[PDB]
């Protein structure tokens, strides 16, 4: 059966808090090679895709494929009961329609057991057309969160622009317009703190800001975020979950 | 006249921060032994009783056994106006219906006064039967509040069970079921060590709403004591800092 | 063109979160001497006067005396986009319709240039004369903020009595009564917390607590607040700025019978 031991359940909790408000319910596709979760929000504008490889877990055992359509809100409500440093064991019996979340303690006298009731979800795996992006900005996740949360105060549409000497996020609204421009750092004191712009052609796109703000709730997962995009192709916000996988949000451009 | 000077006045604040949501209006029974407060909740379900000994306050004087009727909401509102390191003096009069509590600041020359209107409430208090509970469970109040708040996200009723080497909280609801087992610390770190005294097994079901109401007294004492005798209103007891104790009695549901 | 670069950026932030709830839209009078702002509350009960001298700005350049109306809520919403370490550069053309605020991060390549939209304000400068107040109480700001926030729980009117021995705030509400007497402090080491009551005649006034709580929103500006007060003239709550100017709040007394 599905028996996975995660040493630090903070990763799982942060993942659930990153997916909680974008998508209500998702189909965790468990396999012998890892865990996947590909689903698009209720408005069909953005598509979140999570992958957690097997080697990131301590003892990941899966003999048969599973599709556990968990309710993400309830799953996060259960995950909240776990501690910050707890070892989390996910156990899905061969076929039981319940997922056992076992929150052990950091080698202490507390063990918590929860049996989250699954629900049957009509699995659908839409094809993600592999594509080559013209601009790849790599920036500290704090800066992107700040930029989106700031320009959200002005307008609801961010115009992202990739030149060669720096990327600029513009926005406009009733109270004026404002544009934040970042230049690529040359003396990277910390490889985290750098802003690296792999540019192959200057691009300019427009995106909604509700969805970028929904994306930036995954900032505790990784320090660096990768904004990869090209013309007439949904932007790709990528957060690398350290040595165990990634969390990748796709967002379709805005009309006009 | 009742005149009571208390050095660590913040204590009083926390006390009313644990009752203002259970008990709208109470009757402080004041005597030379100290302060007492006994009541049912606002819906006559669970009981609360508070004892503060006269040896706890810095100075105490009570020339006659009086029944000060106080609206706990307004008194908590007033006590919010008292700094943390303040000196509260509840200079009540002999019979006037204006309790007079002064917030002295230490060497800050911020003498503050407050004259709170009393209530002419004379409601009688039922005698609290005292029995030898056989489910003694001393556990850190932080962890107990954690457990209650956690199980509150699953269901409305908690099933508490005790065994010679542990205590199991359980709950159920449409989101699933949850079980927190907690075993007695086997001589593993006297300060936060959980301890269980059981002569027989016991298992009950309590409404989590009132358990969450009780947990608000967590800042009072770091360690809470639980007691449950099969058909006996469970008691949770927080020991105030060598001044008295606060106790909630919760009737198990059937 | 008016261009003013200020390295201590946080000041602006704080000032705007000091006014944005008392005043809704104001008229910044920029001149070669500095920036002034006289603005009356919408209910004609409270007035605010801000002054930022040009010698406090790291770089100041004003050619013609501007008078730009701004929507202090929009300006606060724009300034909330600046970190507490940014260098803030205000810039406006001869008679432009917009005000460009450039927040430059101190040690990064992040430069954010917003462009606020001014409004049309036709305000008249009230003439406030230099007075010699009867009672001047210089106390720590946090102290006054605590006093007002505490008395707001009791009742919605504070009676300030400035006697000889010390000031005394009082309030009475449906749940009781309270009064904080505040005695003058001694010549003890720290200077900021030394209460200093200089009085000439014992005065007693009655003020609204809503506006006093609006005043205390400027406590992060400075550590010492100065309450000037005389008979039948508005209370003057003054907060200095860090050697740049000041921010005074005039509150008018209640109606006495």
PDB file of C-alpha atoms in Angstrom, chain A residues 74 77-78 80-83 109-117, chain B residues 143 146 150 153-154 174-183 185:
ATOM      1  CA  UNK A  74      -9.927  19.619   4.658  1.00  0.00           C
ATOM      2  CA  UNK A  77      -7.207  21.691   8.085  1.00  0.00           C
ATOM      3  CA  UNK A  78      -5.921  18.279   9.174  1.00  0.00           C
ATOM      4  CA  UNK A  80      -2.627  22.182  10.687  1.00  0.00           C
ATOM      5  CA  UNK A  81      -2.990  19.786  13.613  1.00  0.00           C
ATOM      6  CA  UNK A  82       0.541  18.522  12.988  1.00  0.00           C
ATOM      7  CA  UNK A  83       3.499  20.212  14.601  1.00  0.00           C
ATOM      8  CA  UNK A 109       5.589  11.073  23.884  1.00  0.00           C
ATOM      9  CA  UNK A 110       2.946  12.377  21.455  1.00  0.00           C
ATOM     10  CA  UNK A 111       1.530  10.562  18.434  1.00  0.00           C
ATOM     11  CA  UNK A 112      -1.428  11.847  16.441  1.00  0.00           C
ATOM     12  CA  UNK A 113      -3.555   9.767  14.077  1.00  0.00           C
ATOM     13  CA  UNK A 114      -6.012  11.213  11.558  1.00  0.00           C
ATOM     14  CA  UNK A 115      -8.180   9.401   9.014  1.00  0.00           C
ATOM     15  CA  UNK A 116      -9.047  11.929   6.338  1.00  0.00           C
ATOM     16  CA  UNK A 117     -12.076  10.756   4.364  1.00  0.00           C
TER      17      UNK A 117
ATOM     18  CA  UNK B 143      -0.163  20.904  25.109  1.00  0.00           C
ATOM     19  CA  UNK B 146      -3.099  22.497  21.570  1.00  0.00           C
ATOM     20  CA  UNK B 150      -6.715  20.738  17.191  1.00  0.00           C
ATOM     21  CA  UNK B 153     -11.188  21.303  13.774  1.00  0.00           C
ATOM     22  CA  UNK B 154     -12.497  17.739  13.387  1.00  0.00           C
ATOM     23  CA  UNK B 174     -17.386  14.568   8.483  1.00  0.00           C
ATOM     24  CA  UNK B 175     -13.732  15.447   7.845  1.00  0.00           C
ATOM     25  CA  UNK B 176     -12.650  12.143   9.416  1.00  0.00           C
ATOM     26  CA  UNK B 177     -11.512  11.104  12.858  1.00  0.00           C
ATOM     27  CA  UNK B 178      -8.510  12.081  14.937  1.00  0.00           C
ATOM     28  CA  UNK B 179      -6.738  10.361  17.822  1.00  0.00           C
ATOM     29  CA  UNK B 180      -3.992  11.976  19.901  1.00  0.00           C
ATOM     30  CA  UNK B 181      -2.283   9.510  22.212  1.00  0.00           C
ATOM     31  CA  UNK B 182      -0.097  10.964  24.938  1.00  0.00           C
ATOM     32  CA  UNK B 183       1.999   8.742  27.202  1.00  0.00           C
ATOM     33  CA  UNK B 185       6.924  11.024  30.269  1.00  0.00           C
TER      34      UNK B 185
END
